[PDB]
């Protein structure tokens, strides 16, 4: 959430068209979905990560 933010900020601050502002916001949002594990292909990895948080709350009890 910071490299992609810099990338967007450059591609907006240079751009002089709203049709490109739109398409830079789009790729920022899509790139955060992939750098996070929220994609439709990383579902197994996300489930494993949830299963490592399960043990944290277990330890809390």
């Amino acid at each position: 959430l910071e490299c992609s933010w810099d990338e967007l900020w450059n591609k907006v601050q240079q751009a002089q068209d709203l049709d490109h502002i739109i398409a830079a916001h789009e790729v920022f949002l899509d790139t955060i979905i992939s750098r996070c594990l929220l994609d439709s292909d990383s579902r197994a990895l996300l489930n494993q990560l949830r299963a490592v948080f399960d043990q944290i709350i277990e330890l809390q009890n």
Partner: protein, 420 residues
């Protein structure tokens, strides 16, 4: 929750005075506490809000046999620090005994601020180890706060005195303070006077007046160590959240400091990290190893370069550590403030748990052991003898601090999974 700083003793009050002045200049605050006209920061934690924009810090300044507190009063910033919370020997026993008789009303001064604040996380002590009046009283107060606030935490910006070894009862005093601090302090950030003259070597023409001009050094370190709290960021938005990484085991809660541009008066993140790990930037004077390292960078740091720096540092391996703890070195970022000079606009600090500080503890334990065999300086005053006839609190402190030394070396061996 808001933090209250219990600055005590002459030296502790000097460094708390300078720290609050540093945060006055850094934040949008004038010497009378007024919001500055020229002025994005989280001032809630450190500065209480008055109605007419008097940002008065939650400083509790404790004076005993006052000399320098009168000088603190006759200052332009006296109106800045006005909670109106000042209430009137060189031995630890004398300080402890003097604290005991005033313990209720100073504790009411703590209670008032605790009530006045919306809420309370932490007590930050600008404590002086073997500080004559500062020590003893600080140990007693440290013992009182934990009992009265069992949930709450105490941090200690201990200025551990090393002056090449005048106070002749210094090892005894420091010994007792370390027992109280080891068992009754949630965190300690260790500072050293010889190391501070040694960190001052190359940076400013302060060779002879070092102790006078080490105040600025300590103030910069204290401000930078809290800057991530004082300025919002994605992570370490609370003192406890930061502290958890730095202290992995309760006994080993003493933290080494370091600052990349000692001459802060462009550098990439790769460069500042590699520089920081070198021992010159470090300010503290059998295998030995870190337990965990943390670093915060305040500046215009390029974001696709911090991860370059992290893995580049991994390849360099400038910091050697194989502890029991699994905590790896981590890159954190905070906001450089406006209105002040941004010279070397990138600029960083590190807080780490290092086993080397066990050596510094063992040096004062060596001095104490030698002095103890001689019994040259038992003090034998009537205060000292009456308060400790047995003189066995010295021995209890000796065994407790020896346990601490053995625990540090236990952290060094591969089997700290067993009892340390």
């Amino acid at each position: 929750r808001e933090i209250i700083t219990l600055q005590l003793g002459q030296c502790g009050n000097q460094i708390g005075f300078e720290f609050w002045k540093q945060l006055c200049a850094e934040h949008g605050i004038s010497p009378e506490g007024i919001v500055e006209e020229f002025a994005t920061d989280r001032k809630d934690v450190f500065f209480y809000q008055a109605d007419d924009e008097h940002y008065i810090p939650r400083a509790v300044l404790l004076d005993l046999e006052p000399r320098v507190i009168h000088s603190i009063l006759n200052s332009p910033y006296a109106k800045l620090y006005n909670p109106e919370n000042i209430y009137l020997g060189n031995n630890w026993a004398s300080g402890f005994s003097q604290g005991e008789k005033i313990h209720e009303d100073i504790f009411d001064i703590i209670d008032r601020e605790a009530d006045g604040s919306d809420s309370l996380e932490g007590f930050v002590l600008c404590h002086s180890i073997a500080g004559g009046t500062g020590s003893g009283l600080g140990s007693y107060l440290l013992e009182r706060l934990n009992d009265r606030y069992p949930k709450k935490l105490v941090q200690t910006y201990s200025v551990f005195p090393n002056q090449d070894e005048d106070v002749v009862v210094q090892p005894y005093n420091s010994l007792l303070t370390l027992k109280r601090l080891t068992q009754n302090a949630d965190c300690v950030v260790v500072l050293d006077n010889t190391a501070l003259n040694r960190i001052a070597t190359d940076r400013l023409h302060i060779q002879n007046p070092s102790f006078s001009q080490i105040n600025q050094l300590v103030s910069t370190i204290m401000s930078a160590s809290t800057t991530t709290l004082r300025y919002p960021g994605y992570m370490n938005n609370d003192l406890i959240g930061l502290i958890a990484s730095l202290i992995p085991t309760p006994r080993l809660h003493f933290l080494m400091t370091g600052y990349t541009p000692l001459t802060t008066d462009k550098t990439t993140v790769l460069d500042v990290m590699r520089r920081l790990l070198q021992p010159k930037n470090v300010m503290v004077s059998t295998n030995h190893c870190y337990i965990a390292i943390l670093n915060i960078i305040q500046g215009e740091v390029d974001p696709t370069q911090v991860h370059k720096s992290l893995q580049r540092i991994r390849e360099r391996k400038l910091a050697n550590f194989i502890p029991w703890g699994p905590a790896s070195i981590q890159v954190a970022l905070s906001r450089k403030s406006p209105y002040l000079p941004s010279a070397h606009r990138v600029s960083g600090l590190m807080m780490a748990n290092h086993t080397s500080i066990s050596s510094l503890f063992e040096r004062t334990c060596r001095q104490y052991d030698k002095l103890r065999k001689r019994e040259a300086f038992l003090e034998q005053f009537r205060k000292e003898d009456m308060f400790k006839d047995n003189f066995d609190e010295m021995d209890t402190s000796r065994e407790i601090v020896q346990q601490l030394i053995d625990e540090y070396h236990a952290a060094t061996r591969p089997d700290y999974i067993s009892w340390g």
